[PDB]
């Protein structure tokens with residue numbers, strides 16, 4: 001009860017503004033270490049950053065740090081995406097989606113030493129000039145969205161946090177000296193491996209530096225402190241910050257500062273989405289246990305710490321251009337923390353600490369510990385399960401729920417063995433990865449299945465921009481049979497993904513040379529290889545993944561043609577084309593028999609079957625292709641692109657008006673699930689989950705009049721078990737009066753800190769663009 005430090009309303013009354021500080025340090029680091037090998041002049045100016053960076057502790061903190069200079073700041077990395085800002089230099093402040101304030105004077109810095117150095121030298125700039133011909137058109141004609149991962153650094157991986165807590169930069173330096181001593185600059189390949197290893201030495205040094213300046217500030221705050229209490233907490237914030245990364249953790253306090261200290265450095269250098277701290281309930285437990293039975297911490301002192309950490313997680317803002325924001329509104333960092341599941345010996349893995357990590361989200365209720373669960377029905381206690389469901393019906397959006405039994409073989413289906421794959425941890429939205437051991441763009445680019453449907457009915461040409469976007473599959477009125485049809489729908493899938501594999505292959509080669517680290521500092525192999533995450537170095541290198549969006553709309557559109565055209569012969573294609581071309585202006589009798597046909601989600605065998613055929617094909621299709629890091633992977637997750645992808649697709653044989661959102665993930669189109677919620681699951685069980693080893697996403701919008709009877713809890717639980725027992729991968733819930741959302745678009749102000757599940761993550765309703773707000777509204 002007495003943890004009344006919600007005095008971190010500081011974070012809600014804060015405004016997003018660019019933070020071009022670090023961008024200036026980096027500029028200076030580069031200029032003085034020119035001629036160095038790029039990993040050395042990157043890592044030498046990282047030390048510069050944390051040596052000459054703001055250092056600030058805010059008025060009530062027990063855990064400290066911040067990747068920038070401001071709270072809710074937008075971090076520019078000019079080495080990767082400088083020109084994003086030079087473009088929107090005088091709009092970004094007032095843009096509709098995800099805006100940032102660019103102060104009067106930060107903008108002097110930008111075109112005075114940031115812009116005149118970096119002009120023509122960035123990752124993103126190389127991507128704009130090299131994206132392949134066919135890929136580039138499809139991107140333009142609205143068919144897929146590749147530019148996101150050329151502005152946002154690596155991300156989408158859970159780093160080697162457990163080592164930094166357990167060895168500290170002290171013990172990692174030994175690993176560095178071990179493999180440096182085994183090399184010989186006389187010997188063929190060794191200079192590159194020795195030179196990189198130096199960069200790993202600067203960055204270890206830079207973290208050290210930073211963490212001690214932090215304690216230093218905490219002594220300064222002490223020796224001016226009136227409050228007996230808040231003085232004696234400052235002194236322990238220094239006693240910690242002095243040990244923390246340099247040496248191994250020894251207390252609960254000292255683990256959480258190890259962790260988050262490292263967390264912000266990795267986000268310092270690149271700013272990517274989805275740096276997931278991972279199985280936090282598993283490697284912190286030994287510290288929690290021994291501190292309980294010693295007095296150094298009491299359970300309530302624990303959950304205070306956590307609730308602070310959770311407010312620090314809610315602190316930064318993911319930086320993106322004008323448009324990628326539309327495709328992922330809400331500043332989301334996607335920092336996945338997960339509890340529960342299975343042990344290295346196959347036994348339940350859930351301790352007191354799994355519940356208190358669920359607990360701190362019921363308490364703080366900010367958006368940025370992306371909570372998650374690995375529920376192992378045959379291992380995790382019903383007691384665990386209850387606490388999960390109680391969380392959910394806070395309408396919080398949290399936590400996303402994964403069926404542990406599915407997530408394991410997804411990781412086996414990736415080539416990892418059960419000896420290490422039990423540790424899989426949700427990553428970002430719903431992706432999979434593995435702590436310290438997997439490089440992998442778990443979601444390189446999205447592809448618009450709505451556009452495709454619109455392509456086969458239009459024989460390649462784009463309705464809206466009137467160009468020959470895709471290949472010419474022939475016009476739809478010479479398909480004698482249904483298979484002639486399906487044939488052309490596959491051919492159209494095949495043309496798009498090719499282009500994506502080109503683009504992936506191109507940006508792999510850009511990330512290679514030019515986008516190095518010291519995140520890699522926490523991958524054991526990267527150290528003994530003398531080889532970076534970007535280059536190889538990771539234990540298991542996995543091909544990039546390609547997320548599809550428009551599931552509901554493929555199935556419904558294709559089956560609508562099998563029904564009405566090829567064996568119920570009610571409409572000739574001739575006329576269908578006419579109907580959708582015109583948005584059903586005159587033709588609004590057709591739009592009717594379409595939304596009469598079985599829909600994906602009500603669970604009609606004829607549909608579930610086609611749903612299986614298509615996507616086993618889409619899987620075989622991708623695993624065909626290989627880059628330098630293994631064969632490609634796929635998933636189904638939209639983030640928020642289902643809405644703006646919707647705006648480029650015409651009307652479709654599914655009964656969908658033109659320019660509406662596309663479906664979201666593997667959920668149905670809004671207004672087609674007139675059967676149950678238990679038949680929502682069953683229609684989606686036929687999606688082959690373990691073939692899409694990078695994740696699957698389900699959205700469901702519960703009405704809040706449910707938390708009433710004293711079984712809503714007992715009954716939500718049992719439904720979670722249906723999901724798992726059917727072999728479905730993931731489900732997550734909203735629990736909200738429409739009444740509230742509707743008012744909040746009216747008066748955005750008296751609804752601060754109100755949450756919603758968008759897809760994979762959680763945003764503040766008021767801070768999203770109106771389009772996506774409707775999309776979320778219209779869900780049943």
Ligand SMILES: CN1C[C@@H](O)C[C@H]1C(=O)O
Nearest residue numbers: 273274328428429443639
């Ligand atoms: C679609 N991506 C998957 C999530 O990890 C990251 C998201 C994004 O960066 O926008």
